[PDB]
Amino acid sequence: ALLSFERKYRVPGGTLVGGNLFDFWVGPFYVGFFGVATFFFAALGIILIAWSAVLQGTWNPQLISVYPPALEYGLGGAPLAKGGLWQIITICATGAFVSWALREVEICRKLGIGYHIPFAFAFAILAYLTLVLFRPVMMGAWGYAFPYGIWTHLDWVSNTGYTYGNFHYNPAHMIAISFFFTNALALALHGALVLSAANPEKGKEMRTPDHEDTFFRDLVGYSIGTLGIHRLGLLLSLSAVFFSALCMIITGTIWFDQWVDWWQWWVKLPWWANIPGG
Amino acid sequence: AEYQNIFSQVQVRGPADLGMTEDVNLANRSGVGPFSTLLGWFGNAQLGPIYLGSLGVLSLFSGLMWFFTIGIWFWYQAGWNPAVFLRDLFFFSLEPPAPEYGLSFAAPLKEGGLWLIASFFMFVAVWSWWGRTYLRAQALGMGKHTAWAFLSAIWLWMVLGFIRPILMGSWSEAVPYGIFSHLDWTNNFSLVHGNLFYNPFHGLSIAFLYGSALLFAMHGATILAVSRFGGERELEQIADRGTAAERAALFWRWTMGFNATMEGIHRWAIWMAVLVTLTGGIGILLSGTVVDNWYVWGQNHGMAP
Amino acid sequence: MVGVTAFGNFDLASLAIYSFWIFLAGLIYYLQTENMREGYPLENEDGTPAANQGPFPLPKPKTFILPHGRGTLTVPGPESEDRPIALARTAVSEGFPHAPTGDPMKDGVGPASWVARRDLPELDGHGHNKIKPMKAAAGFHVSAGKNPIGLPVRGCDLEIAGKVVDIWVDIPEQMARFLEVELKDGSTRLLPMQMVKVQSNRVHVNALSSDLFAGIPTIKSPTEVTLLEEDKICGYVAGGLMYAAPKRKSVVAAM
Ligand code: BCL
Ligand code: BCL
Ligand code: BCL
Ligand code: BCL
Ligand SMILES: CC[C@H]1c2cc3[nH]c4c(c3C)C(=O)[C@H](C(=O)OC)c4c3nc(cc4[nH]c(cc(n2)[C@@H]1C)c(C(C)=O)c4C)[C@@H](C)[C@@H]3CCC(=O)OC/C=C(\C)CCC[C@H](C)CCC[C@H](C)CCCC(C)C
Ligand SMILES: CC[C@H]1c2cc3[nH]c4c(c3C)C(=O)[C@H](C(=O)OC)c4c3nc(cc4[nH]c(cc(n2)[C@@H]1C)c(C(C)=O)c4C)[C@@H](C)[C@@H]3CCC(=O)OC/C=C(\C)CCC[C@H](C)CCC[C@H](C)CCCC(C)C
Ligand SMILES: [Fe+3]
What we know:
The complex is a heterotrimer. By secondary structure, chain A is an all-alpha fold. Helices cover about 50% and strands about 0% of the residues of chain A. The longest helix of chain A has 27 residues, at about 170-195. Chain A is flat, with a radius of gyration of 25 Å. By secondary structure, chain B is mostly helical. Chain B folds into two domains: about 15-145, Photosystem II protein D1-like (Photosynthetic Reaction Center, subunit M, domain 1, Up-down Bundle), CATH 1.20.85.10; about 145-300, Photosystem II protein D1-like (Photosynthetic Reaction Center, subunit M, domain 1, Up-down Bundle). In chain B, helix 1 runs antiparallel to helix 3, helix 3 (about 115-135) runs antiparallel to helix 4 (about 145-160) and helix 4 (about 145-160) runs parallel beside helix 9 (about 265-280). Chain B is globular. Helices cover about 15% and strands about 5% of the residues of chain C. A three-stranded antiparallel β-sheet of chain C has the order 1-2-3, with no helix packed on it. In chain C, a hairpin with a 4-residue loop joins strand 2 and strand 3. Chains in contact: A-B, A-C, B-C. The interface between A and B is large, with 96 and 98 residues. One bacteriochlorophyll A sits at the interface of chains B and A. Chain C: Its main location: membrane. Chain C: Heterotrimer composed of subunits L, M, and H. Chain C: InterPro entries: Bac_photo_RC_H_C (IPR014747), Photo_RC_H (IPR005652), Photo_RC_H_N (IPR015810), Photo_RC_H_N_sf (IPR037097), PRC-brl_dom (IPR027275), PRC_barrel-like_sf (IPR011033).
C-alpha cells in the first residue's frame, strides 16, 4: 500500500481529467493530468531557469536573476536575454501552480474530502498576478513587476516602496500588516494550546476539550471553540493577502506620490478636527 | 454540501458549562454571560465566564497607569481639548532621548524621562499576564505551552525595547510611544543599519511569518473540509484516530510526499510561530552591538544582488 | 578595528547563524517530526535475505493515560489492521488503483471508509457522554432558525427521503452535530449536519438519494453513539458524491 491506512482509501476516483490512463501513484505521489502538466511548467521551469544564468549570470543561486522586460517595451514581447525570459518563465509559473491546485481537487474526490484546501490556495495565486500581471498591466509594462532572484527581488520592495516615501503610511499595507501578525500569533495559541490538552504534566491524565473552552474563556473573557480557530485560521491568512493585494493596486494607478499625505484628507478637513464642541 | 463550516446555519443553546478550577471560583463565575446571536454563527455564543485573579489585576493597575502617562504625555505638544486630540492622535508620541546621553536615566523626568515611567509599567503589566496564562493553567489541568509560547513574544518586546538598546549604551534607541512615529522608528532603525534586508534573522523571521501563514491557512482548511466526520475535536482523534484524521493525513501525503499526525501539525505550529520573533530578537540583540552596517556583511562574505 | 569580528575577518555573527541553522535542521527531522506516531511502521512483505527496504528514525512509545476509564494507549502501537477489505487489483504497478468488488458504500471501501474506532461514548469532562438528541436534554433550546423535526428530507432523486424528529447536538460544547431521520418505514437514520442543506420546507442533501438513505449504518443503541458508529455513517454519506450518482467520479467536461 505504502502505509497502514493508505490501502483502504486508494480507489480509481478523482479523474477530472478523463477516466484513468493517468490515475496512478508513483510512490507516495499521485500522477495525473496535472502531474505531468505540473512537471510541465516545472521541467521547462528548471529547464529554462538554469539558462538565463547560463548567460553570464553569476555564481551562487542567490545573485542569479531574471530581470523582467524593459519599460519602453511596455506591453509587447521582448526578445530574450534582455528580460523576455520572465514572460516565458512566468507563463509556466501560473500554469505550474494553478494546475497543482486542480491536481488537489482530484485527490479530494476519492477521499471525498473538502474542496477547501485548494480554494485556499488560489487566494494565494491571486496576489502573485496582481504583483506581476495586473499591477504592471494597469500601469504600462511587464516592468513594474519583480525580478526573479533570491537576493535581488529584495531591491524591488525597497525601491518601489520608498518610491512612495513610507509605504507604512499605506491604507491597506497597514491593514495586511495587522492581519499578518494576528494569525501569526494566533496559531501559536491554538498551536501551543492543543499539544497542552493532549500532553499535560508528567503523571497526570489526558484532559477533555471541556477544559480548552474553560481554560481560555477563563482568560480574556471569551473562548471561541474548535471550529472557531479553524474558520479563524482561514480568515486572518486569507485576509492578509486580500487586503494586501488591495493597496498595491492603489499605488501608481490610484495614487501619485506621498502615502502620508493621503492621510491628510482627514487632517485639514473643514471644521478642523471635525466636530469640536461648543 | 458544507456551510456547516462558516455560516453555521443552525444554533443550539441552554445551560452553561464550567470546569473545576483547582484554585477557587471566588473571582471566577463573574458576569452573567450574555449570549451573542450572530456571534454564534461564526463562533460560540457565550460571553463569559471570566476570571478576576491576583496577577490579573496588577496588569490592569499597571497597564492602565501606562496608557495614561502617554496620553497625559501627549499633552505638552497638544494645548489640550478634543479638536486637537482628535486632529492628530496618530501623530502624537512620547519621544525618547534627545540630547541623546546613553543609559543614564537621562535628563530629568523630562526628557525622555516620562518614556522612562510608562515603559516601566508595561514591564509590570505584561509580566503580570504571563503569571496568569501560566499559573492560570494549573487549575483547569492543562499545561503552559501557552505561557512559554508567550515568552518568545516577551523576548522581542524585551530586546528592541529594554534588553537590546542597552548592550549599546544610549537609551535614545528603543521604540517611542505612538502610532505614526513608532512606525517611523522601525524605518530609521534599518536605515541606520544599512538595510535590515541583509540581516539574516529578520529575514528568517519573515521566512517564519509566511510559514505560520502557510501553515495556519492550510490547517484550518484540512480540518474544515474533514469536519464532515468531525475532523475537529482533534484531541479525541489524538486518542483514537478516525478516518477524518487520515483522510486529511493522506491528502498532503500524495501531494507533497509526507503526512504527519493530527498532533504533529499543531507541533509544527507552536514551533513555527515561536521561531518567529525568536530569531528576530537574536537578530536585534546583534544589530548595533556587533554590526553598524548590515549590507557590508552580505558583500563582506558573498551574498547580495 | 571593529570589536566584533574574531580574526582576519571572522565575525561572531557568522557562526551565530550556523549554530542556529544546523541545530535548526536538528528539530525538524527528529523532534518536530514525531509525525510517525500514526501510520508507522509501514506495510512490508515476506521473501529473501534482507527485505528490500524499511524506516529506523522511529522514536519511543508515548503512553496516553486516557480521559476517563482505563487509560493506556501508547501511540507507537503495532496497529496495522488486516480486517475485512474487499479491494482487488487493476494493473501490475504499486500505484495502479484498486476497484470496488461489490457495493462500495455498502462494503467499507473508498470515499466511503470507516476506521476500526473504539466502542465508547466519545467523552464528557463530567463523565457522561456528548452526542445526544434533545429528547434527552433538558434546558437546551433550538432557537428560531431552522427547526426540522417534521421538515422534509431529500437528495438528488427528489423527496420522501424521510421526515425529521430531532438533532444530536453538542451537549458539553454547544453546537449541532447530527440530525435524526426516519425513513417512515425505517425509524433510525441520522445523517451528518456538515453535508445537508437546511432551509424552509426542504432539507436538501447531496451525498445520497432516498434510494440509499435505506441501508446506512444503524445505531444499535437508542440514545447513545460510540466513536465507531459516527465514522461509518459519516463516511457513508460523504461517499455519495462519487459512488452515488453512478457517473459522479467521472469527467464533467473536457479539455
Ligand atoms: C522599505 C520597503 C517597505 C515595504 C514595501 C513593500 C512592497 C513594495 C510590498 C510589500 C509587501 C508586503 N509587506 Mg511590506 N514593506 C515594508 C515593511 C513591511 C513590514 C514591517 C514590519 O514594517 C511588514 C510586516 C510588511 C509586510 C508585508 C506583507 C503583508 C506583504 C507581502 C506578504 C504577502 O502577501 O505575500 C504573498 C506571497 C505570494 C502571494 C507569493 C505567491 C507565489 C506563488 C503562489 C507560489 C509559487 C509556488 C512555488 C514556486 C513552488 C515551490 C516548490 C518548492 C521548492 C518545493 N512589510 C517596508 C517599509 N511591502 C508586498 C505586498 O503584498 O504589497 C503590499 C509588496 O509588494
Ligand atoms: C517589529 C517592528 C516594529 C513595528 C512595526 C510595525 C508596523 C509595520 C506596524 C505596526 C503597527 C502597530 N504596532 Mg508596531 N512595531 C514595533 C513594536 C511595537 C510594540 C512594542 C513591542 O513595543 C507595540 C506595542 C506595537 C504595537 C502596534 C499596534 C498598536 C499597531 C497594529 C495593531 C496590531 O495589529 O497589533 C496587534 C493586534 C491584534 C493582535 C488584534 C487583537 C488585539 C486587540 C488588543 C484585541 C481587541 C479585542 C477587543 C478590544 C475586545 C476586548 C474585550 C476585553 C478587553 C478582552 N508595535 C517594532 C518597533 N508596527 C501597525 C499599524 O499600522 O498600527 C496602527 C503597522 O502597520
Ligand atoms: C510581497 C513581498 C515580496 C517578497 C518579499 C520577500 C522578503 C522581504 C523576503 C522574501 C523571501 C523569500 N521569498 Mg519573496 N516576496 C514576494 C514574492 C515571492 C514569491 C512569489 C511567486 O510571489 C516567491 C515564490 C517568493 C519566494 C521567496 C522565498 C524563496 C524566500 C523565503 C520564503 C519563505 O520563507 O517562505 C516559505 C517558508 C516555508 C515553506 C517554511 C520554512 C521552514 C523553516 C522555517 C526553514 C528551516 C530551514 C530552512 C532550509 C532555511 C531557509 C533559509 C532561507 C533564507 C529561507 N517570494 C513578494 C513579491 N521575499 C525571504 C528571503 O529570501 O530572506 C532572505 C525574505 O527575506
Ligand atoms: C523599512 C523597515 C524594515 C523593517 C524593519 C523591522 C524592524 C525594525 C523589526 C522588524 C520585525 C519584523 N519584520 Mg520587518 N522590516 C521591513 C520589511 C519587512 C517585510 C517585507 C516583505 O518587506 C516583512 C515580511 C517583514 C517582517 C517582519 C516580521 C517577521 C517581524 C515582526 C516583529 C514584531 O512585530 O514583533 C512582535 C512582538 C510582539 C507582539 C511583542 C508583544 C508586545 C506585548 C505582548 C503586547 C502589549 C501591547 C498591548 C497589550 C496590545 C493592546 C493594543 C496597544 C494599544 C498596542 N519586515 C523593512 C525593510 N522589521 C521585528 C523583528 O522581529 O525584529 C528583528 C523588528 O524589530
Ligand atoms: C493565504 C494562503 C496561504 C497559503 C496557502 C497554501 N499554499 C499552498 C497550499 C495552501 C492551502 C497548497 O495546497 C499548496 C501545497 O501543496 O501546500 C502543502 C501550497 C503551496 N504554497 C507554496 C508556497 C507559498 N505559499 C505562500 C503563501 C501562502 N500559501 C499563504 C500564506 C508563499 C508566500 C507568501 O511567499 C509561498 C512562497 C508552495 C510551497 C506550495 C505549492 C507550490 C508549488 O509547489 O508549486 C509547484 C511548482 C513547481 C513544483 C515547479 C515550478 C517552478 C517554476 C516554473 C519556477 C519559478 C521560479 C521562481 C520565480 C523563483 C523565485 C526566486 C527564488 C529562487 C528566491
Ligand atoms: C509567537 C508569539 C506571538 C504571541 C503569542 C502570545 N501572545 C500572548 C500569549 C501568547 C501565547 C498569551 O498568553 C497572551 C494572551 O492572553 O494571548 C491570548 C498574549 C497576548 N498577546 C497580546 C497582544 C499581542 N501579541 C502579539 C504578538 C504575538 N503574540 C506573537 C505573534 C502582538 C503584536 C504587536 O504583534 C500583539 C498586539 C495580548 C492581547 C495578550 C496579552 C499580553 C499583553 O499584551 O499583555 C497584556 C496587556 C495588558 C494587560 C494591557 C491592558 C490593556 C489596556 C487597558 C489598554 C488601555 C485601553 C485600551 C487601549 C482601549 C481598548 C480597550 C479594549 C481592550 C476593550
Ligand atoms: Fe487544530
